[PDB]
Structure formats: structure tokens, C-alpha cells
Amino acid sequence: MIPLTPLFSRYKDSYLLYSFRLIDLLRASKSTHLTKLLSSQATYLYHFACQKYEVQQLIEWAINASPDMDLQQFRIEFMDKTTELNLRSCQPKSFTYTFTTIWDTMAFLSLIIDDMVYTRDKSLDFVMQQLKTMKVLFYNVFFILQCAMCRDHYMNVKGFIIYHIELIEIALDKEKYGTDITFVDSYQQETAGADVSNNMLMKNLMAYVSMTFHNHINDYKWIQRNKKPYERMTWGEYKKLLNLQ
Amino acid sequence: MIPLTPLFSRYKDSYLLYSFRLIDLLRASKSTHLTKLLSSQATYLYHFACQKYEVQQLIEWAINASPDMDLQQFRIEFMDKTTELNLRSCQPKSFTYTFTTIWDTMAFLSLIIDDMVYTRDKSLDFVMQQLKTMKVLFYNVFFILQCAMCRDHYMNVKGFIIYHIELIEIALDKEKYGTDITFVDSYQQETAGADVSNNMLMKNLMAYVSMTFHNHINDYKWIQRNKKPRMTWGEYKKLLNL
Ligand SMILES: Cc1cc2nc3c(=O)[nH]c(=O)nc-3n(C[C@H](O)[C@H](O)[C@H](O)COP(=O)(O)OP(=O)(O)OC[C@H]3O[C@@H](n4cnc5c(N)ncnc54)[C@H](O)[C@@H]3O)c2cc1C
Numbered sequence: 001m002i003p004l005t006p007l008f009s010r011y012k013d014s015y016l017l018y019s020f021r022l023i024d025l026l027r028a029s030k031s032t033h034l035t036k037l038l039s040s041q042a043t044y045l046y047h048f049a050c051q052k053y054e055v056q057q058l059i060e061w062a063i064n065a066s067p068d069m070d071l072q073q074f075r076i077e078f079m080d081k082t083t084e085l086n087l088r089s090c091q092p093k094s095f096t097y098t099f100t101t102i103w104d105t106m107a108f109l110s111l112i113i114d115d116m117v118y119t120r121d122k123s124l125d126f127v128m129q130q131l132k133t134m135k136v137l138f139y140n141v142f143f144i145l146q147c148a149m150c151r152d153h154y155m156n157v158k159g160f161i162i163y164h165i166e167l168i169e170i171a172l173d174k175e176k177y178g179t180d181i182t183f184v185d186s187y188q189q190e191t192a193g194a195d196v197s198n199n200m201l202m203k204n205l206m207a208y209v210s211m212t213f214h215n216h217i218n219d220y221k222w223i224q225r226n227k228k229p230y231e232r233m234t235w236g237e238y239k240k241l242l243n244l245q
Numbered sequence: 246m247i248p249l250t251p252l253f254s255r256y257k258d259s260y261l262l263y264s265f266r267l268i269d270l271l272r273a274s275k276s277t278h279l280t281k282l283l284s285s286q287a288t289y290l291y292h293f294a295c296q297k298y299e300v301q302q303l304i305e306w307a308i309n310a311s312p313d314m315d316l317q318q319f320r321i322e323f324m325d326k327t328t329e330l331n332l333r334s335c336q337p338k339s340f341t342y343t344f345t346t347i348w349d350t351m352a353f354l355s356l357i358i359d360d361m362v363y364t365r366d367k368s369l370d371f372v373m374q375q376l377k378t379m380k381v382l383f384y385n386v387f388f389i390l391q392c393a394m395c396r397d398h399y400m401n402v403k404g405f406i407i408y409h410i411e412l413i414e415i416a417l418d419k420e421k422y423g424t425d426i427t428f429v430d431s432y433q434q435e436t437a438g439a440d441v442s443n444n445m446l447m448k449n450l451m452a453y454v455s456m457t458f459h460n461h462i463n464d465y466k467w468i469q470r471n472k473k474p475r476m477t478w479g480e481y482k483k484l485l486n487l
Pocket residue numbers: 099100102103141149150151153154210211212213214215216217218221224233
């Protein structure tokens with residue numbers, strides 16, 4: 001499992017805040033299509049929180065919650081409902097919602113993907129069905145906060161993340177057909193390999209993808225705001241921060 | 246600019262065929278939104294082929310061409326309209342439309358990007374606006390042929406390409422601010438470099454990206470088809486003289 005770290009503790013909390021604000025939309029959904037999308041997203045999101053039937057109850061309760069409540073009201077009723085459904089574990093400890101709330105949620109999901117691929121068993125079908133759900137979650141990241149330019153940017157470049165999930169998928173698919181997964185420690189080793197029958201995969205790939213992608217957005221926003229850009233996050237510091245080995 | 250090789254000639258020809266089939270959609274478009282999008286991709290596409298006013302006439306002609314012509318008929322009048330607008334250059338020499346037609350278009354566009362950044366002049370605003378247009382183009386590739394699964398997949402992973410276009414923009418943005426672009430022979434030195442004062446960018450980045458991506462889709466399709474099972478950068482550079 002994932003190394004219990006201060007940073008990973010925030011991630012898990014922003015992840016619950018994220019899931020909470022997501023089901024809050026359900027009341028106000030103005031399309032059957034978005035209602036379906038929200039409820040699967042939330043169901044999936046809780047499906048990775050470290051009982052499905054109590055979660056169905058929570059989701060169904062959110063669908064029917066009054067559209068005339070404000071968010072603080074929804075919050076209080078949410079707290080009772082998770083209390084009543086023995087889902088106190090879903091209750092966020094902090095409700096201040098920001099960009100970091102989203103970054104953490106994405107980082108948390110990435111760590112769970114690496115962990116699944118680490119702790120797999122030759123259940124290989126299982127992890128490949130999980131990864132497909134992961135693709136659906138990353139494809140449909142809601143901002144909830146307003147940042148129209150963040151939404152347009154993310155819909156341009158989110159294939160970067162989803163591309164690396166498909167790599168893992170291709171790696172596991174090979175391990176089904178006989179070539180085992182060789183784990184390497186650098187992204188350069190991994191890409192150098194796929195430029196040939198090898199099956200090399202970078203250890204903690206998605207964490208690295210997560211970190212790189214976060215750095216990419218922050219580099220680019222200096223183009224967007226038009227200014228001259230000062231301490232970027234690096235894979236080394238990140239592994240230390242998360243006790244990734 | 247681009248090494249004239251046999252393979253590049255086919256890319257050029259598929260590029261036109263792709264452009265031809267796209268403007269044929271305009272007459273049948275079922276929304277203002279698709280109409281605006283098609284006519285803009287078309288205008289952009291011709292803008293990268295080697296006058297703008299005569300391309301506007303062509304596209305305006307496509308917009309009003311009768312929705313009741315079949316496509317063979319549309320081809321006849323396109324061949325006349327281009328002949329009349331001195332756009333014989335935009336005439337495809339082959340109309341056999343296939344996945345390869347699409348691959349070649351994407352490959353062609355990638356080569357244009359790599360070429361503009363190579364033949365740049367420290368006109369940095371010019372190429373930085375051309376790349377934005379390139380982003381819209383890769384975001385909006387129509388399959389035209391019918392492959393629902395293909396549209397779904399490409400809509401999923403297309404940001405992989407677009408991401409590397411942004412890298413180039415981050416690269417030319419740094420070169421405008423005093424750190425020069427250091428060109429580099431491998432993807433690996435590029436990615437390792439950003440993980441640290443530096444402005445390294447791999448030579449023929451988009452050709453490599455185009456080739457890796459093409460490989461990715463074909464690897465992944467043995468998952469989708471549920472079956473048991475490749476072009477390499479070295480062979481690719483030889484075939485194109487990069
Ligand atoms: C999907 C998404 C898309 C976005 N698109 C845009 C956009 O297009 N234009 C725009 O102006 N803003 C965009 N943003 C917001 C932007 O990326 C920053 O969050 C914003 O600039 C706020 O600045 P910050 O430094 O306070 O946040 P951040 O720099 O993101 O810091 C938040 C936390 O994350 C940690 N962190 C910082 N960098 C990294 C890193 N590389 N890797 C891992 N952890 C890191 C830090 O510990 C910090 O605690 C986007 C955010 C998200 C989640």
C-alpha cells in the first residue's frame with residue numbers, strides 16, 4: 001500500500017473534499033447526461049477511497065437532495081448522512097476548496113494506480129478494469145471552482161496523463177501473454193525501451209506523470225498571463241516528500 | 246525546409262486528400278457549429294500546404310456547393326474550382342481515403358511544426374501563433390471515415406500530442422526571454438532536462454511524437470480487439486532524411 005506520509009494525508013483529504021463538492025452538483029444538475037456523469041464519477045471516486053452499497057445510498061441521497069439548499073446546508077445534511085451510513089471515513093476534515101484540492105485529488109489517484117500495478121497478482125484482469133475506470137475519471141475532471149481557461153487548457157492536454165495509463169495497460173496486457181513487467185527507476189529508461197519484445201515500466205510512473213504534468217501547467221501559465229517567470233518541483237524532492245522507494 | 250523524399254510526397258498527397266474530403270463535409274453540415282469548425286480547419290490546413298484569398302474563395306465555394314451532389318460530383322467541381330482559382334496545387338493525385346490518409350496528415354503537420362521552429366528567426370511571435378493554430382488542428386481531427394472506436398480513443402489520448410506542442414511554445418517563450426533553445430538528439434535528454442536554467446528541445450520532436458503515438462494506437466488495438474500481437478525512430482529518420 002501507499003506510504004503513509006504527511007503529504008499523502010493532505011491528498012486523501014482534498015480527495016474527500018473533492019468527492020463531497022462533486023456530489024453537491026447532483027442536486028443542481030441540469031441534464032440527464034451530467035447527472036449520469038456525476039454519479040458515476042463520485043461512485044468511482046469513493047470506490048478508490050481507502051462499502052459500495054452504503055456509497056450507493058449516499059449517492060442516491062445526494063441525487064434527491066433539495067436543489068434549493070445552499071452548499072453549507074448540503075454540507076450539514078451530508079455530514080449526518082455519512083454519519084448515519086457509517087461513512088464517517090468519507091467526511092473531509094477541511095472544506096476550504098482550491099486548485100490544490102484538485103491537484104491533490106489527481107495526485108492521489110495517480111498514487112493509487114502505481115500501487116495497484118505494484119501489488120497486482122498474475123487479478124490482472126482486475127487491475128486492467130480499474131485502469132479503464134481511472135481513464136474515465138481523468139477524462140472528466142470537474143473544476144467546480146470557476147476557471148474557464150483552466151478548463152479549456154486541461155481539455156487540450158489531459159490526453160498526456162491518459163496516454164500513460166494506456167501504457168501501463170499495454171504493460172499488463174503483455175504480462176498476460178508471457179513477457180513480464182520489468183520495473184525501471186527513470187522515465188528515460190522506460191521511453192528508451194519502447195523504441196525497440198521488452199516490457200519495461202517506470203516505478204511510480206503515474207506519480208512522475210502527475211508531477212511532470214503539474215509542472216507543465218505552471219510553466220505554461222506564464223505564456224498565458226504574459227510575464228517573465230521560481231522553485232520548480234523535481235522528481236527527487238517529490239519521492240522524498242512521499243517516501244516513494 | 247522539409248527533405249523532399251518519397252514518403253514525404255505521399256504525406257503531402259494524403260494531406261490534400263484529407264483537406265478535400267473535409268471541405269466536402271461543409272455542404273452537408275447539420276449545425277452552425279460544425280460549419281464554423283470545418284471551414285476553419287480547412288482554411289488552416291491549406292495555410293500550411295506549400296494564396297490565402299484564393300483559399301477563401303475555394304472554401305466559400307464549398308460552403309454553397311449543393312447539398313444534393315454526391316461526392317463524386319463534388320470532386321468534379323472541386324477540380325474545376327481549383328483549376329479556376331490557380332489552386333491546381335491543392336488537387337490530390339489520389340483519392341483513395343484510408344487510415345493512412347489520416348496518419349499522413351498528422352505526420353505532415355508534425356513535420357511542418359518541426360520545420361517552422363528550425364527555420365525560425367529570433368519572428369518568434371509568428372511561430373508561436375502558428376503553433377496555437379496547430380493545437381486547434383490536432384484537437385479537431387475528423388475521422389471522416391467511420392471508426393467510432395477510433396474517435397473515442399483519439400479523443401482520449403490526443404492531449405499527448407498537444408502537450409508536446411506546448412513544450413515547444415514554452416521553449417520559444419524562453420528563447421524570447423534570453424535562454425536560447427538548445428537542440429538535442431534524443432527525447433530522453435529533453436525530458437531529463439526539464440527535471441532540474443535549461444532550455445533543451447529534441448530535434449524533430451514532433452516527428453518522434455507522431456511516430457511514437459502512431460505506435461501507441463497500434464499497440465493498444467490488440468487490447469481492444471482482444472488478440473495477441475513496429476516502426477522505430479531510426480528507420481523513421483532514414484525514411485524521411487531527418
Ligand atoms: C487540471 C488543472 C488545470 C489547471 N490549468 C491552469 C491554466 O490553464 N492557467 C492558469 O493560470 N492556472 C491553471 N491551474 C491552476 C494552476 O496550475 C495553479 O494551481 C495556480 O497557478 C495556483 O498557483 P499555486 O502555485 O498556488 O498552486 P500550485 O503550484 O499548484 O501548488 C499547490 C500545491 O501543490 C504542490 N506542487 C506545486 N507544484 C507541484 C508539482 N509540479 N508537482 C507536484 N506538486 C506540486 C505544492 O506543494 C503546493 O503545495 C490548473 C489547475 C489544475 C488542477
